[PDB]
Amino acid sequence: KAIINSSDMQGDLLQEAQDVIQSGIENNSAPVLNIEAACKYIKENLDKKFGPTWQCIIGEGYAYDVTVQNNTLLFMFYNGNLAVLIFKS
Amino acid sequence: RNKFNYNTRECQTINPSIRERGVSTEPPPSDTICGNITQ
Numbered sequence: 465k466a467i468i469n470s471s472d473m474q475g476d477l478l479q480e481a482q483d484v485i486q487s488g489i490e491n492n493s494a495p496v497l498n499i500e501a502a503c504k505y506i507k508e509n510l511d512k513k514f515g516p517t518w519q520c521i522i523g524e525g526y527a528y529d530v531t532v533q534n535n536t537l538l539f540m541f542y543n544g545n546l547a548v549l550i551f552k553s
Numbered sequence: 554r555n556k557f558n559y560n561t562r563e564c565q566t567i568n569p570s571i572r573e574r575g576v577s578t579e580p581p582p583s584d585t586i587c588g589n590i591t592q
Contacts (some may be wrong), residue, residue, distance in 0.1 A: 469591060478557045525590055525592065528590045529588065530587065531587065532588075534584045537586075537588075540592075547590070547591065
């Protein structure tokens with residue numbers, strides 16, 4: 465249940481980002497899951513796929529303030545209440 | 554005189570010109586934003 469909240473990049477990379485966060489959920493889908501392992505997976509996948517200097521962040525209540533390259537930023541929400549930010553720098 | 558008179562000849566090669574031209578690259582630009590995290 466992906467709910468995109470703020471988009472900056474191109475729709476293809478949008479789709480692949482959603483697919484990768486999904487695959488991360490399945491890699492870690494259990495009460496013992498940690499968002500950190502899925503974060504590692506998201507960032508490393510987007511590195512080996514669309515280049516380095518990616519950054520994955522997952523949570524539900526927090527406050528970031530980061531610098532991002534244009535057309536390389538996404539933030540979104542899940543019906544499962546997972547707010548997921550990703551960005552390249 | 555004894556060997557009969559010789560015959561002049563001519564040959565020259567093709568000589569390209571030397572030009573001095575200099576060009577530039579530039580450091581690509583970058584962006585720096587800041588955003589907050591929503592509920």
